[PDB]
Amino acid sequence: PGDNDLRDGPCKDITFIFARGSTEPGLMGITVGPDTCDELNREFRGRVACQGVGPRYEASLAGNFLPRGTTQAAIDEAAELFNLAHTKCPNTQIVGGGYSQGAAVMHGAIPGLSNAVKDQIKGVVLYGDTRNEQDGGRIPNFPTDKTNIICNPGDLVCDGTLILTAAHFTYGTRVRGAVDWLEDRLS
């Protein structure tokens, strides 16, 4: 899988739409985005398309202090990608993902999607979620049993302010658990 597969590749049975954080470069970032994509593909080999939220989402650090914790352009771009999966590949199983500010993108884009698009989203994994406290530990109007907010012990960004600590940068160790959780929701 690549980083622009939903826009530029054939439909796959599983489509991973991921919004990066800690302003890593590229559509997918460098750390947990590619890691999650790679491990999903190893569990469902050849059946996974991977898609980063970009390039209109620029993942700027200052964007964390906008009202929704990211730019409206980023939220719009993510929503367009979920809707594209729905029209281009109506049978694909969508997995949403975000890290840090990328979780704020997912918190903003998913609530407004149609019921039918939400039916296609089988799970959303949010690493180091900067909006955990602000949205009450869930994505608004999206099922909690399809939501996995992963907060490391000591990662204070999940407590309502942007206090960065070393624990915010260790989510590579949580990818195996994230993919185990996704497997219970994917076929």
Author numbering: 13 to 199
Provide passages from the article that reported this PDB entry.
Cutinases (EC 3.1.1.74) are the smallest member of α/β hydrolase family, capable of catalyzing not only hydrolysis reactions, but also esterification and transesterification reactions. McCut is an α/β hydrolase with a central β-sheet of five parallel strands surrounded by nine α-helices.
The crystallographic asymmetric unit contains one protein molecule. The side chains of Ser34 and Phe181 extend to the catalytic groove leading to the space steric hindrance. Moreover, two gatekeeper residues, Leu73 and Leu176, in McCut are 7.2 Å apart, whereas the corresponding residues (Leu87 to Val190) of AoCut are separated by 9.2 Å. The overall structure of McCut showed a low B-factor (13.44), indicating high rigidity of the structure. The close distance between the two gatekeeper residues and the space steric hindrance created by Ser34 in McCut may explain its poor degradation ability on PCL in comparison with that of AoCut.
